[PDB]
Design a protein around this ligand. Structure first.
Ligand code: 0O2
Ligand code: ZN
Ligand code: ZN
Lengths: 99, 118, 1160, 50, 119, 90, 49
């Protein structure tokens, strides 16, 4: 199996297919251990955001690829923004203040 | 057929949190793909299309670029008709359509928009 | 003059309670109808759970009705229906709220271990706090006569007390009653009076609850949260997209359970609102309130009390909490079955053509449109979708120096993911280098690996400068090489030695490379003779460089030709003069330490190529006649059975103890097994006769199997002993051993009986394997969770103290030395010398300078070395104090990630640990790290004094020892059970043994010393790896034990509140800032405390990191109570947020941002 | 989108009010059709090939 | 006494956390999904001190608690029902009479009537 | 540096900063002002920066200083426009 | 597990100290479980289903 870019689930904007392509591979805890061990901060940075479930990030970075710019321009993944809305959905309030 | 449509309203129905394959662990709501989103490839092609068309209307004249641009309404939101453009360019209707047809005549050699079609 | 009001960069996130007005701030409308979607039009209702005006539009830019369609009105709402036409993702982020009638208690702050609403109010949970709000027993809200302030009354008591007084002590019941109860509560005045009362003439009979609540009350009042928010009056609503009802295939909608919950709570709340306007029967309305409580409690967090249901499913409904209490799929990835690739290098991998085509799709597109060919992006798509030859050439350009990292399923350590250079291979399988096939612990049984494509620029360099296979020469666990040649290659190089006498031999001398021409041209053999040749050696000394050294040594054909592979340096010949076994790795090791990286890599490729090639040339096979059975087998068996026959006959006529003759006869068969094993080995080893010149001589058998055994290549003594010898004593399901061992062997026939006996061993073998394989990772998780936060920082601090390193010697009564545990270690300070000078102060023991610790004779077997255990660092690890042990030869780079690498290295060999005064195995490791007290703990003398009996069994009691000397006595408690070791009158030292049994780590750390307890743990955890034969450096053990001693306990008087056990982090940083601040008397003295891995990991600053592993429902709630904030240096909590990790390639980013967050 | 409206206008609209969802053999595999089959609804115009 | 001494003395520390043990040594009605969480929360985690926070905290159902207050019968007969109904009509009558005293209610009825006839 | 990359770390300690600065230089080359120092020989921008660092040229202080000169060149050489804008709002 | 009744072991440490504590159990084909077990104090208890 191999996947450049395909569909995503409605609930969590994570890669999945089986209708035209193949749902991308799963990372997990075992792998993030290794990346932390190496120190590949940007590798894990992309692997956790744009490369996975960053709505605008994946597209912005894809455009950066076809233009031969690479870089990244990341953002907060929906798999954490959703968690904010879920916790905020309770009587408990969480905010992300600046400095 | 009325009865057919009736049975299409029965049941709650099913919830997403229903186990299916019993993996580790399966969930019906996890197989549902999103469709409101567009493919990144599709987005890139649309972007390149804007640049392509924005680069094609450069090889035209002002009284032809603006004509094709305004008639089919591009980069100006509200699209106008033959009358609203025929009044702003003196000669009304047919005249502005002639150029509108001539502009289309020019685009019979370039391959950019051709391949962008598909 | 900043103060920006946009979504910019955040330095921290805060967690706390939410006010009703705070909920209103998120409210983009109020859900008022249980309605979701229309039954016919399938259109969002007015004010339902899926409103368009409240939340977001269905379609992207067109409204509900259709008065407005395109981007013309993206900022203006619709006229007929107030629908803000923006995006459809808005429907995913819009909140909304429901405003309940009568107050409702939050299920979390109500019943979650401690009653947060109770403990803050000081009132029983499921006892009193239940009956007073479930409409049963009215409660008081402050009384100035007869009644107290928080007593519980019945309706009879209520009316009676109302008749006696009344109209001056009004106190309602139910939800709003508890609301007024918390609201009337004054945290400030209570904080004062509680501090006053709970300090007046009271010993240790009260101090517990006193200090507890006062710290809790102080925390809550300082938090900023008002106790009013404890029970909510306005319940917010989760966005529709996070709980949608999407139509599936051919009708049959699919909705979330939250919709059912919200629909129920909306219904019951509405009826409650309607009842408070119509006729108001007390029983009916109060019940509806209890029902409203049910709905709300079910929606917030089901748990927990019977479990709400409905929805046809017999299974419960996933509440809000259940969706956040308890794997990251990624684009640009793939996987396939792996295959050996001999012709490949050490930094290359076989990547399938079609596979690599789909992977670098976007890159191929851009490169195509860059050169030409494709007129546009879609042209490239249509050009690669129709694989048009030329595209492949473009592929050869994009994958040129674009590294791709491979990964195996069981990721134990860092070498689970290694990067390679992509090489196109006409096939659908992924080829891999057979050298790094050991680091993955991968076989070609059909195992499949995954591939990832480093998209980011710095991500590519990360994979090349860190995750590249060429940079991982040595194992992170042990300094020894990891890419060391295995079975096939080592067998080949073993065949390229093996000096055989005569047979086309003779001492025909030449000059190195010339000998190659001799080998291909036949005439001479290959394993002769020995024969002499001219070897041009190369050495360096002092001023480095190179010094030639031509000589005439007596090697062989194989050694001569193989010598060409050896790099410029090295002692030469003598590395080849040996053979192929374990020195095969030694040669690679020395090549690395004396030359460098690249030379070691190319040397590895050459020795692999050579090994494989000559291995094929050899043609070593495995026939049935290769495993020769001993002739004395039947003899030995008959003799053994004769002895056991005599023993059985003796047992028949009494004499010998029949109760344990079982054991001694086992010794008979066991001894017999050793006889057969020794006989087979002595036979299969030497043998042969040859015929040198005048014939008659002996070497060693060229018997294939033996060649495999005497050269690694998967072939051990036990296995061979079972092949030709015999399978010895077999295990029985009872746990006992059968007194009739497998006399036969695999070379011979096997009776049904003994095979039905061996099936037990195979069954329990696979079963135990399945257990310890998962149990190993089970331990790894705890190790990582507790250690994955410390990173080597602040370069190299001061301090000299450190554990005195000494060779682990069991040689006291068994003779077993190990003195390589000191290397790459930074010296404490000039560790003496039988005379003067020598060793410097902070000089790290080099690989060549550790061999200098042999020129100082066997006298010097003790050196003080800086370790991570000590180190006067604060929130990190001194570079010097750690070491250097990596795939790198130098010291650990500042800002690495010691924690995860340490944990991984520890839990890596966990797969090969046999679970069981010696427990032994993985369970022993777990118990040692958890710091658990033994089943029969020994006792020590806390203070050196005079041993004397303290009233013979006068309690209670049980003996009592009182070591008293100098000043003040001590009365320990001996429970009669178990004897002693010191008579009365005798004197003892500070920490002497007075039980001669198992020692407890807590007592060691508490009394003996930190160096002693750490030495104990490391030297006890190694002893379980010694038997298992798994090499692992002590550094990592010292690393986990470092933060294993994270917290302590202060006992005196200072700015810290005494009884509170706090970590030495804040302690040391605050004690240093008090001796020269105002006065050293405003601070106390601390005392280290030993706590297990689990207990240590339980405590952590970040509430998000805590919300990860441990119970989320608890940590999130308690962190909500006190206005806590993650800010924000942890690795784990910084991963789920999706940002740069505060380590490795990052760190510098976090360092800059950390200093940046000092202005305000 | 305006650009797409112009583009089709340059090469011919034919903007049918229909989409596409034809069953296509997945990319990678390839073989020979050995048997077709059609299960029609009870009350639907049967197909020619059916 | 019983619950405290049994829980503490037995669990030291039950090794594998033998849950299926003391839950039967507890009184009242069993097989509940309520007391389940209050035991898995005390055994581990905050060890030692938590075992002192349990007893101090130890020092139910909608329908069953609804039947409780409903238990107060106060049932009626034909005489009772008619009696209550009579009080109802008496109250209603007194109210309507009190409204009859109000002249502005009549004149307003007159005004709204002329509004009705005026359509 | 197709295989260490280890010969570059001893030129600037801690491989991590090596990755940062190398990624920095590679960022300059891939997009914007290219102009490599070491001959390309058909190699990606990924390795080109590493070869330069190995060669001895292009470090951290070097790039920062050249950035200072780059800023002083873009700003000071084109101040005639900014100064004319400074008189915009007095 | 075959229906009927059998006496289980439960031998070994079940409450420290270590002392047998045998127990009987009746397993129906279609009904409710009927167990009989001892305790450290040598009392007899019954478990219905
Ligand atoms: N240390 C180092 N090596 C370099 C460098 N540039 C190229 N190489 C070597 O180039 C070798 C590969 O040569 P080729 O296979 O012909 O590829 P090239 O066409 O040469 O690319 P090129 O122009 O050199 O960059 C590798 O062989 P190997 O021997 O390593 O692979 P192994 O030991 O497994 O054989 C690299 O070591 C460099 O800047 N530093
Ligand atoms: Zn509208
Ligand atoms: Zn240090």
């Amino acid at each position: 199996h191999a996947r450049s870019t395909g569909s995503y689930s409605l609930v969590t904007q994570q890669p999945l297919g089986g209708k035209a392509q193949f749902g991308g591979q799963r990372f997990g805890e075992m792998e993030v251990w290794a990346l932390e061990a190496y120190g590949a901060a940007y590798t894990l940075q992309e692997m956790l955001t744009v490369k996975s479930d960053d709505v605008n990030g994946r597209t912005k970075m894809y455009k950066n690829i076809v233009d031969g710019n690479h870089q990244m321009e990341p953002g907060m993944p929906e798999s954490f923004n959703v968690l904010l809305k879920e916790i905020r959905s309770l009587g408990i309030n969480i905010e992300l203040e600046d400095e | 057929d009325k009865i057919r449509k009736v049975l299409k309203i029965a049941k709650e129905p099913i919830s997403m949190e229903t186990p299916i394959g019993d993996d580790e662990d399966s969930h019906l709501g996890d197989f549902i793909e999103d469709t409101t989103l567009e493919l990144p490839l599709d987005s890139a092609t649309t972007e390149s299309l804007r640049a392509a068309t924005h680069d094609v209307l450069a090889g035209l004249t002002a009284r032809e670029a603006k004509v094709l641009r305004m008639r089919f309404g591009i980069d100006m939101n509200t699209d106008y008709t033959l009358e609203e453009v025929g009044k702003q360019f003196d000669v009304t209707r047919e005249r502005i359509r002639q150029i509108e047809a001539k502009a289309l005549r020019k685009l019979r050699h370039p391959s950019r928009s051709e391949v962008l079609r598909s | 003059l900043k103060a920006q009001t946009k979504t910019e960069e955040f330095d921290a996130i805060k967690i706390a309670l939410a006010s009703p007005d705070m909920i209103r701030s998120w409210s983009f409308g109020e859900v008022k109808k249980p309605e979701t979607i229309n039954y016919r039009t399938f259109k969002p209702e007015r004010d339902g759970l899926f409103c368009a005006r409240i939340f977001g539009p269905v379609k992207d830019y067109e409204c509900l009705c259709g008065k407005y369609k395109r981007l013309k009105h993206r900022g203006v709402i619709c006229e007929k229906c107030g629908v803000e036409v923006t995006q459809t993702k808005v429907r995913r982020e819009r909140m909304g709220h429901i405003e309940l009638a009568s107050p409702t208690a939050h299920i979390w702050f109500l019943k979650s271990l401690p009653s947060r609403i109770g403990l803050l109010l000081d009132m029983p949970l499921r006892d009193i706090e239940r009956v007073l709000y479930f409409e049963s027993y009215v409660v008081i809200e402050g009384g100035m006569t007869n009644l107290e302030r928080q007593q519980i009354l019945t309706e009879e008591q209520y009316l009676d007390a109302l008749e006696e007084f009344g109209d001056e002590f009004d106190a309602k019941m139910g939800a709003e009653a508890i609301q007024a109860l918390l609201k009337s509560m004054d945290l400030e005045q209570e904080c004062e009076q509680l501090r006053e009362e709970l300090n007046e003439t009271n010993s240790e009979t009260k101090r517990k609850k006193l200090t507890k609540r006062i710290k809790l009350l102080e925390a809550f009042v300082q938090s900023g949260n008002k106790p009013e928010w404890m029970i909510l009056t306005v319940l917010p609503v989760l966005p529709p997209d996070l709980r949608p009802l999407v139509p599936l295939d051919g009708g049959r909608f699919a909705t979330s359970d939250l919709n059912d919950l919200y629909r129920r709570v909306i219904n019951r709340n509405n009826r409650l609102k309607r009842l408070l306007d119509l006729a108001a029967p007390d029983i009916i309305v109060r019940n509806e309130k209890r029902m409203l409580q049910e709905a709300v409690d079910a929606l917030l967090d089901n748990g927990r009390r019977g479990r709400a249901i409905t929805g046809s499913n017999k299974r419960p409904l996933k509440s809000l909490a259940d969706m956040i209490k308890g794997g990251k799929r990624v684009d640009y990835s793939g996987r396939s079955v792996i295959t050996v690739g001999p012709y490949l290098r050490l930094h290359q991998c076989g990547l399938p053509k079609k596979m690599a085509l789909e992977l670098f799709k976007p890159f191929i597109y851009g490169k195509l449109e860059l050169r030409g060919l494709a007129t546009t992006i879609k042209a490239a798509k249509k050009m690669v979708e129709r694989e048009e030859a030329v595209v492949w050439d473009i592929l050869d350009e994009v994958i040129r120096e674009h590294p791709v990292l491979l990964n195996r399923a069981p990721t134990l350590h860092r070498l689970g993911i290694q990067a390679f250079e992509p090489v196109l291979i006409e096939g659908k399988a992924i080829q891999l280098h057979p050298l790094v096939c050991a680091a993955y612990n991968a076989d070609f049984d059909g195992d499949q690996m995954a591939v990832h494509v480093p998209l980011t620029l710095e991500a590519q360099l990360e994979a090349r400068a860190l995750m590249m296979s060429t940079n991982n020469i040595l194992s992170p666990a042990n300094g020894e090489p990891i890419i060391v040649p295995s079975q096939d290659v080592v067998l080949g190089l073993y065949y390229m030695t093996r000096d055989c006498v005569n047979a086309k031999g003779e001492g025909m001398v030449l000059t190195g490379p010339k000998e190659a021409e001799r080998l291909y041209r036949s005439g001479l053999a290959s394993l002769h003779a020995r024969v002499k040749v001219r070897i041009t050696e190369y050495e360096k000394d002092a001023n480095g460089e190179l010094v030639a050294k031509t000589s005439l040594k007596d090697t062989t054909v194989g050694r001569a030709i193989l010598w060409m592979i050896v790099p410029k340096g090295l002692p030469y010949s003598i590395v080849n003069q040996a053979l192929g076994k374990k020195a095969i790795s030694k040669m690679l090791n020395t090549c690395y330490r004396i030359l460098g990286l690249k030379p070691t890599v190319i040397f590895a490729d050459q020795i692999m190529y050579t090994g494989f090639a000559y291995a094929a040339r050899s043609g070593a096979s495995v026939g049935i006649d290769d495993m020769v059975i001993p002739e004395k087998k039947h003899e030995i068996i008959s003799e053994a059975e004769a002895e056991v026959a005599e023993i059985q006959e003796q047992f028949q006529s009494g004499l010998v103890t029949a109760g344990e003759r079982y054991n001694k006869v086992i010794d008979i068969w066991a001894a017999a097994n050793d006889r057969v094993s020794k006989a087979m080995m002595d036979n299969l080893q030497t043998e042969t006769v040859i015929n040198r010149d005048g014939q008659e001589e002996k070497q060693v058998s060229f018997n294939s199997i033996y060649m495999m055994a005497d050269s690694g290549a998967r072939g051990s003594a036990a296995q061979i002993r079972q092949l030709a010898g015999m399978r010895g004593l077999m295990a029985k399901p009872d746990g006992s051993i059968i007194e009739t061992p497998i006399t036969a062997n695999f070379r011979e026939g096997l009776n049904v009986l003994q095979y039905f006996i061996s099936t037990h061993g195979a069954r329990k073998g696979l079963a135990d394997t399945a257990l310890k394989t998962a149990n190993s990772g089970y331990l790894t998780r705890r190790l990582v969770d507790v250690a994955q936060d410390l990173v080597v920082t602040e370069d190299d601090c001061g301090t000299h103290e450190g554990i005195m390193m000494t060779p682990v010697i069991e040689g006291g009564d068994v003779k077993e030395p190990l003195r390589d545990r000191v290397l790459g270690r930074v010296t404490a300070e000039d560790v003496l010398k039988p005379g003067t000078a020598d060793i410097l102060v902070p000089r790290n023991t080099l690989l060549h300078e550790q061999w200098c610790d042999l020129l100082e004779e066997n006298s010097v077997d003790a050196v003080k070395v800086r370790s991570v255990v000590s180190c006067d660092t604060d929130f990190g690890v001194c570079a010097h104090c750690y070491g250097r042990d990596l795939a790198r030869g130098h010291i650990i780079n500042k800002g690495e990630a010691i924690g995860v690498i340490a944990a991984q290295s520890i839990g890596e060999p966990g797969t090969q640990l046999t679970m069981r005064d010696i427990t032994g195995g993985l369970p022993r490791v777990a118990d040692l790290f958890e710091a658990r007290r033994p089943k029969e703990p020994a006792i020590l003398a806390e203070i050196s004094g005079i041993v004397s009996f303290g009233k013979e069994t006068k309690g209670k009691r049980r003996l009592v020892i009182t070591p008293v000397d100098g000043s003040d006595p001590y009365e320990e408690m001996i429970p009669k059970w178990r004897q002693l070791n010191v008579f009365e009158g005798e004197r003892v030292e500070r920490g002497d043994v007075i039980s001669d049994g198992p020692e407890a780590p807590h007592d060691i750390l508490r009394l003996r010393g930190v160096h002693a307890v750490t030495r104990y743990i490391v030297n006890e955890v190694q002893d379980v790896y010694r038997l298992q034969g798994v090499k692992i450096n002590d550094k990592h053990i010292e690393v986990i034990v470092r933060q294993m001693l994270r917290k302590a306990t202060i006992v005196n008087a200072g700015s810290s509140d005494f009884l509170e056990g706090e970590q030495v982090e804040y302690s040391r940083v605050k004690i240093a800032n008090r001796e020269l601040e105002a006065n050293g008397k405003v601070g106390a003295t601390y005392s280290r405390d030993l706590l297990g891995i689990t207990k240590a990991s339980l405590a952590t600053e970040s509430f998000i990191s805590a919300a990860s592993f441990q119970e989320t429902t608890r940590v999130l709630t308690e962190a909500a109570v006190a206005g806590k904030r993650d800010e924000l240096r942890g690795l784990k909590e910084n991963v789920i947020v999706g940002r740069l990790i505060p380590a490795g390639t990052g760190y510098a980013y976090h360092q800059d941002r950390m200093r940046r967050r000092a202005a305000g | 989108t305006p650009e797409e409206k112009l583009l089709r206008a340059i090469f011919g609209e034919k903007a049918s009010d229909v989409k596409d969802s034809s069953l296509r053999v997945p990319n990678g595999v390839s073989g020979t059709v050995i048997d077709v089959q059609v299960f029609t609804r009870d009350g639907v115009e049967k197909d020619k090939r059916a | 006494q019983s619950q405290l001494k049994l829980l503490v003395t037995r669990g030291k520390e039950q090794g594998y956390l033998t849950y299926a043990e003391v839950n039967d040594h507890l009184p009242e009605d069993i097989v509940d999904s309520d007391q389940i969480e209050d035991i898995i929360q005390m055994i581990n985690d905050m060890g030692i001190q938590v075992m002192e926070e349990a007893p101090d905290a130890d020092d139910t159902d909608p329908v069953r608690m609804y039947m409780r207050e409903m238990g107060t019968v106060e049932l009626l007969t034909r005489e009772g029902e008619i009696d209550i109904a009579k009080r109802i009509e008496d109250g209603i009558n007194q109210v309507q009479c009190s409204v009859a005293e109000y002249p502005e209610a009549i004149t307003y009825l007159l005004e709204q009537y002329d509004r009705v006839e005026a359509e | 540096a197709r295989v260490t990359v280890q010969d570059a770390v001893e030129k600037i300690g801690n491989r991590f900063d090596l990755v940062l600065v190398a990624a920095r230089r590679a960022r300059q080359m891939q997009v914007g002002g290219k102009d490599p120092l070491v001959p390309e020989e058909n190699d990606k921008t990924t390795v080109i920066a590493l070869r330069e660092i190995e060669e001895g040229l292009i470090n951290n202080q070097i790039l920062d200083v050249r950035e200072r000169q780059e800023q002083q060149e873009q700003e000071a050489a084109e101040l005639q426009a900014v100064t004319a804008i400074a008189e915009g709002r007095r | 597990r075959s229906p009927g009744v059998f006496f289980d072991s439960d031998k070994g440490k079940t409450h420290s100290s270590g002392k047998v504590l045998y127990n009987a159990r009746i397993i129906p084909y279609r009904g409710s479980w009927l167990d009989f077990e001892f305790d450290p104090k040598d009392n007899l208890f019954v478990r219905i289903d």
